[PDB]
């Protein structure tokens, strides 16, 4: 990577599946070396060894390198020292969790455990941020009330909460997007939506303008236009 960035002076990309194996490999060697474990088995030279790597993928005036890293985690504990210190050296993250895979919604990136420094009101527009803001709020209310919902019905719940929830369930299912490289697996032909298109589709859907048609119309389809087509399909 360094040779492309520098010598040929071209921008690069990097993929790793999985870079957890890198921290794991250290911990194995560490014991025998004469070093003693830092906490829960892992090498005490963990912080330094992560650090050096993530500064050597860095962005200069000679090339800038966009990276995609897949971190493996045992039983999804993220309070552990190895997943945790990587998140600081990442400007944006897309935490992928088991629940959203059980919901039958691939992709499985959690929407409520996502962060970005790339999402601002002038980095991608004021408008882009306000459409994303509203998605974030809606699902966080819907989660707040999962307890209450289960304990008692929605007729014993508030009418106001029920709008947020009804919006939120539809918005969760809408997040889905079958893939054209796992067309087989998904069971549905792949779809793609542009960045510009994506905001628009979510903007409308939030204001109630396309909440009134099935929650399965939003399951496993891409942008807004695919949902309207799937409704026709459903209707027959």
Partner 1 sequence: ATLKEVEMRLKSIKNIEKITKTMKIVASTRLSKAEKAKISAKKMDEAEQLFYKNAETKNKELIVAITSDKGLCGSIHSQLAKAVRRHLNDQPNADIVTIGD
Partner 2 sequence: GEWFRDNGKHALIVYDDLSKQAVAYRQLSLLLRRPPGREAYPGDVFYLHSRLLERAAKLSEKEGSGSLTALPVIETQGGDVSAYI
The residues binding partner 1 (CB under 8 A) are 77, 79, 147-148, 150-153, 155-156
Distance CA 193, CA 225 (A): 10
Largest Cα span, the chain: 70
- Measured from the CB atom, the residue of 12 and 78 that comes closer to partner 1 is 78
The smaller minimum CB distance to partner 2, of residues 90 and 149, is found at 90
Enter the tokens of residue 226. Answer: 């695919």
CB of 1 to partner 1, least distance (A): 36
Site for partner 2 contains 36 (CB under 8 A): yes
CB of 41 to partner 2, least distance (A): 5
Site map 51..90 versus partner 2, x via CB under 8 A: -----------------------xx-xxxxx--xx-----
Q: How far apart are CA 144 and CA 142, in angstroms?
A: 5
| Closest CB to partner 2 among residues 68, 92 | 92
Name the minimum Å distance from CB 79 to partner 1: 6
CB of 149 to partner 1, least distance (A): 10
Backbone dihedral angles phi then psi of residue 24, each to the nearest 5 degrees? -65, -40
Binding-site partner at residue 32 among partner 1, partner 2, none, CB < 5 to 8 Å by type: partner 2
How far apart are the C-alpha atoms of 108 and 198, rounded to whole Å?
A: 17
Distances (CA, A) of 227 to 31, 33, 208, 235: 55, 58, 14, 12
Instruction: Determine, following the binding rule CB under 8 A, whether residue 104 of this chain makes contact with partner 2.
Output: no
**188 vs 193: CA distance, rounded Å:** 16
Partner from partner 2, partner 1, none contacting 151, C-beta within 5 to 8 A by type: partner 1
Residue 147 CB, shortest distance to partner 1, in Å, is: 4
Q: For residue 46, what are the contacts with CB-CB under 8 A and spacing of at least 6?
A: 23, 26, 27, 38, 81, 82, 85
């Amino acid at each position: 990577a360094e040779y492309f960035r520098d010598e040929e002076g071209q921008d690069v990309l990097l993929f790793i599946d999985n870079i957890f194996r890198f921290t794991q490999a250290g911990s194995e060697v560490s014991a025998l070396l004469g070093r003693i474990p830092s906490a829960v088995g892992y090498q005490p030279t963990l912080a330094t060894d992560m650090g050096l790597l993530q500064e050597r993928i860095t962005t200069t005036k000679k090339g800038s390198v966009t990276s995609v890293q897949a971190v493996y985690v045992p039983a999804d504990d993220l309070t552990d020292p190895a997943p945790a210190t990587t998140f600081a050296h990442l400007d944006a993250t897309t935490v992928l969790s088991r629940g959203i895979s059980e919901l039958g919604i691939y992709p499985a990136v959690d929407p409520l455990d996502s962060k970005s420094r790339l999402l601002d009101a002038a980095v991608v527009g004021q408008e882009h941020y306000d459409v994303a803001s509203k998605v974030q709020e809606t699902l966080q209310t819907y989660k707040s009330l999962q307890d209450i919902i289960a304990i008692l019905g929605m007729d014993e719940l508030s009418e106001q909460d029920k709008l947020t929830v009804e919006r939120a369930r539809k918005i969760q299912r809408f997040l889905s997007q079958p893939f054209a490289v796992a067309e087989v697996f998904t069971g549905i032909p792949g779809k793609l939506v542009r960045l510009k298109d994506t905001v628009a589709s979510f903007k409308a859907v939030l204001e109630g303008k396309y909440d009134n048609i099935p929650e399965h119309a939003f399951y496993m389809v891409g942008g807004i236009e695919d949902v309207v087509a799937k409704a026709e399909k459903l209707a027959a």
